[PDB]
From a paper:
We further focus-refined the stably associated Delta RBD-1-ACE2 region to 3.4-Å-resolution, which clearly depicts the side-chain densities of the mutated RBM L452R and T478K. Specifically, the substituted K478 forms a new hydrogen bond (H-bond) with the main chain of N487 (also resides in loop), potentially stabilizing the key RBM loop. Of note, this substitution also results in the formation of two new H-bonds with ACE2 (including Y489 with ACE2 Y83, and F490 with ACE2 K31), enhancing the S-ACE2 interaction. Further inspection of the surface property showed that the T478K substitution makes the substituted site more positively charged and hydrophilic, which may strengthen RBM interaction with the negatively charged and hydrophilic ACE2 in the interaction interface. Corroborating this, the Delta variant RBD-ACE2 interaction area (928.4 Å2) was enlarged compared to that of the WT (843.3 Å2). Collectively, this Delta variant RBM T478K substitution could stabilize and induce conformational change of the RBM loop and strengthen the interaction with ACE2 receptor, potentially leading to enhanced transmissibility of the Delta variant. Another mutation in the Delta variant RBD, L452R, is not involved in the interaction with ACE2, however, this mutation results in a hydrophilic, basic local surface property reverse, and an elongated side chain, which may affect the binding of MAbs targeting this region, potentially leading to immune evasion. Noteworthy, our Delta RBD-1-ACE2 structure showed that the T478K substitution in Delta can stabilize and reshape the RBM loop by forming a new H-bond with N487 also within this loop, which induces the formation of two additional H-bonds between loop and ACE2, thus enhancing the binding affinity of Delta S with ACE2.
The spike (S) protein of SARS-CoV-2 is a glycoprotein that forms trimers protruding from the virion surface and mediates viral entry into cells. The S trimer uses its receptor-binding domain (RBD) to bind with the host-cell receptor ACE2, followed by a substantial structural rearrangement to fuse the viral membrane with the host-cell membrane. The Delta variant harbors multiple mutations in S protein, including two substitutions (L452R and T478K) in the RBD, the D614G substitution, a cluster of mutations in the N-terminal domain (NTD), and two more substitutions near the furin cleavage site and in the heptad repeat 1 (HR1). Here we present cryo-EM structures revealing two conformational states of Delta spike and S/ACE2 complex in four states.
Numbering used by the authors:
A (entry chain E): 333 to 526
B (entry chain A): 19 to 615
């Protein structure tokens, strides 16, 4: 019997940005969550709905693993019932969330001298996000009634602003890689338990 | 679909783009201050010009949102600091003449050398050259040569440049809907939009000259004691009835009187308080000064320093392989990175400075949650006041005995508390008329209150009336004496050194009455008391988002700028100074002159 490929979600060499967060449908494998508490390298391990003790006694149908890179003080926005520039425009968790959230510092892989401008985020979106909705869009945010035919000018801003990741930044500005496991029970058979 | 909706939307584009350019303009400016090198001087000028040009494209975009239609007072504070054109209202000739003058006015001040053309031994640099001869010399002509011949070239090649600097910066402020340029420097203390807390730009003149009518009975006794003690050093030069000569106050202009303490001690047979012989014998280094300065701010409730504070900041002079301008500046680079740059040594003057330049960082760490245009002090003399109340608390013998520095059986008497206050009165009270008179001079040269012929006659008419200082030999109109100072040539505001004094005792009387002290104010201390540092942190975290009259009411309870704490600090000295001045002449006469023959 096989193990779950958690070595592709947590130890990936290049993560994604929070506007275009990845998602991996993990199913039909013997998931070992007991080595995740004892790793002692995750800065934040918050489990909503489930317990860290009940995670090896219960079996789930689908375990979705959403991975992205955010700032230091925006890890608190990845929580059921938060608001900000990430929990409303980039990655919104539903209010009845039933999963666990991983978060750990990655300053020595995601920050180069001079700036690592590969990670971006939605700064301006014309509405709010539904829970677990991802929309990659490069549309110029019409903040008025002019209108603007693509030309980024007066009160028509580009929504994807980049992250200024540098190795000399503070704790609250250093890149925290975040993996969000979202367990669920559906009307299919379930075989993901340790 | 409303202007206040598009204003917050525009500032979210600003705060998430200016923060990525202010860091690269400060990290590149940090690399020049640590490495004085021909390569790193351009990286602070290429990346420093990317932010200097960024604030010009946003100041042309932010003026499309009128400030009459926005009702949120937080947005109107960020847009008022962004819609100001500055020097963009001038033409191409006048803006080029201004930057040519400012790059040349700071050049003749810094690179002005003093030599005697008749003697080969009389040549020296500025620091530690010309600053040494004007401080620790006991002669009259040795100080007069370093004072007249310093303004014989720097005070003469800065007169026609500063004459054109008056008419250039007046058109910079008359087109910005201010009255003069003197009314542009009082625009930092301006508060509009709040009912009951309206502070006008013209009420700063009404407040500064009202605070001087109470500090003048204290200064007249400090001046009459310093003059009476200078009779024993120069018995054939100073009259004990008139005023003081200019070059005997301690340094090149006479701003601080700190170097006059070594000759005018109150009691010379008493042991002076010092930890310099208690830091080398205990083997203190550059880390232990800041490890013991960090425990002062943790004990009042302010948080610890960052981990990036200890690996990136420069504390020790890094050998001879690289030269670093290590004047003590506390660096707030933005994006949560807080550093500090100073050449530390094992002395008390660098132990109190480490408390002074970490109190700036505990202020910059407090308003980090604010937006980018509100990350500053409540006014200009508000940042330097919260940094120096820590220097007034880390020098008392209650703190120097708490960290094992001072002796456990060091006696404190009546004659010890005076000798500490006269070291403080020459640095704090003695610089108060010198700070007010120069800003009385700049606000009267920008208002057009003087013509050209009394340009240098009405400057020494104010030194012989406010600070009580005569000239040794008269200067004609070809001279220009105030431009020799650093803040006049490099065009800095100077009233921020007058209001930081009146605020640092309003704060300390507010932080000692919160810490429940029973006794005089100069023996007080705020450490080991969380209920006093949490009083200050509710003001430190505000930043510029609140007006400075409401930030004073958060800690003191008075919206005004008051004197009475500063007279309550020096009250054990002012009681003694009256009793030492029964036989002297309290007050001065303008008619005396050393060349009145």
């Amino acid at each position: 019997t096989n193990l779950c490929p958690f070595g592709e979600v947590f130890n990936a060499t290049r993560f994604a940005s929070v506007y275009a967060w990845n998602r991996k449908r993990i199913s039909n494998c013997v998931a070992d969550y007991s080595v995740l508490y004892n790793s002692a390298s995750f800065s934040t391990f918050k489990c909503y709905g489930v317990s860290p003790t009940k995670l090896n006694d219960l079996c789930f149908t689908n375990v979705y693993a959403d991975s992205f890179v955010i700032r230091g003080d925006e890890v608190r926005q990845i929580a059921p019932g938060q608001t900000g520039k990430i929990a409303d425009y980039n990655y919104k968790l539903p209010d009845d969330f039933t999963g666990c959230v991983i978060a750990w510092n990655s300053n020595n892989l995601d920050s180069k001298v001079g700036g690592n401008y590969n990670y971006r985020y939605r700064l301006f979106r014309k509405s709010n996000l539904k829970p677990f909705e991802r929309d990659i869009s490069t549309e110029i945010y019409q903040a008025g009634s002019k209108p603007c035919n693509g030309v980024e000018g007066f009160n028509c801003y580009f929504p994807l602003q980049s992250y200024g990741f540098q190795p000399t930044n503070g704790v609250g500005y250093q890149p925290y890689r975040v993996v969000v496991l979202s367990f669920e029970l559906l009307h299919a058979p379930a075989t993901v338990c340790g | 679909s409303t202007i206040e909706e598009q204003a917050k939307t525009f500032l979210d584009k600003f705060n998430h783009e200016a923060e990525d350019l202010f860091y690269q303009s400060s990290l590149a400016s940090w690399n020049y201050n640590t490495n004085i090198t021909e390569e790193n001087v351009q990286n602070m000028n290429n990346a420093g010009d990317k932010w200097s040009a960024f604030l010009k494209e946003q100041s042309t975009l932010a003026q499309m949102y009128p400030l009459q239609e926005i009702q949120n007072l937080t947005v109107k504070l960020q847009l008022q600091a962004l819609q100001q054109n500055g020097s963009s209202v001038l033409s191409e000739d006048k803006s080029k003449r201004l930057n040519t003058i400012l790059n040349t006015m700071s050049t003749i001040y810094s690179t002005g050398k003093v030599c005697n053309p008749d003697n080969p031994q009389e040549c020296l640099l500025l620091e530690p050259g010309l600053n040494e001869i004007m401080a620790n010399s006991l002669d009259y002509n040795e100080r007069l040569w370093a004072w007249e011949s310093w303004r014989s070239e720097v005070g003469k090649q800065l007169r026609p440049l500063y004459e054109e600097y008056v008419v250039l910066k007046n058109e910079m402020a008359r087109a910005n809907h201010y009255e003069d340029y003197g009314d542009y420097w009082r625009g930092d203390y301006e508060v509009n939009g709040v009912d009951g807390y309206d502070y006008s730009r013209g009420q700063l003149i009404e407040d500064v000259e009202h605070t001087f009518e109470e500090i003048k009975p204290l200064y007249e006794h400090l001046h009459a004691y310093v003059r009476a003690k200078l009779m024993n050093a120069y018995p054939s030069y100073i009259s004990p009835i008139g005023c003081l000569p200019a070059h005997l106050l301690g340094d090149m202009w006479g701003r601080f009187w700190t170097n006059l303490y070594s000759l005018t001690v109150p009691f010379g047979q008493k042991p002076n308080i010092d930890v310099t012989d208690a830091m080398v014998d205990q083997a203190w280094d550059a880390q232990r000064i800041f490890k013991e300065a960090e425990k002062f701010f943790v004990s009042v409730g302010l948080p610890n320093m960052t981990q990036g504070f200890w690996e990136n900041s420069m504390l020790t002079d890094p050998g001879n392989v690289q030269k670093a301008v290590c004047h003590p500046t506390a660096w707030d680079l933005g994006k949560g990175d807080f550093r500090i740059l100073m050449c530390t040594k094992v002395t008390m003057d660098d132990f109190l400075t480490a408390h002074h330049e970490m109190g700036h960082i505990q202020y910059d760490m407090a308003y980090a949650a604010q937006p980018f245009l509100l990350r500053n002090g409540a006014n200009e003399g508000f940042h330097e006041a919260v940094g120096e109340i820590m220097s007034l608390s880390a020098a008392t013998p209650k703190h120097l005995k708490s960290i094992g520095l001072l002796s456990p059986d060091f006696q404190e008497d009546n004659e010890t508390e005076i000798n500490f206050l006269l070291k403080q009165a020459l640095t704090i009270v003695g610089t108060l008329p010198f700070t007010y008179m120069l800003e009385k001079w700049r606000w009267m040269v920008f208002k057009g209150e003087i013509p050209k012929d009394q340009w240098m006659k009405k400057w020494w008419e104010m030194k012989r009336e406010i600070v009580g200082v005569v000239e040794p030999v008269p200067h004609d109109e070809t001279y220009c004496d105030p431009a020799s100072l650093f803040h006049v040539s490099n065009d800095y505001s100077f009233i921020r050194y007058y209001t930081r004094t009146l605020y640092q005792f309003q704060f300390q009387e507010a932080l000692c009455q919160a810490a429940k002290h029973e006794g005089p104010l100069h023996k007080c201390d705020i450490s080991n008391s969380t209920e006093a540092g949490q009083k200050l942190f509710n003001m430190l975290r505000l930043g510029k988002s609140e007006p400075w009259t409401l930030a004073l009411e958060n800690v003191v309870g008075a919206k005004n700028m008051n004197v009475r704490p500063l007279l309550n600090y020096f009250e054990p000295l002012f009681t003694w100074l009256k009793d030492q001045n029964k036989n002297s002449f309290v007050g001065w006469s303008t008619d005396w002159s050393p060349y009145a023959d």
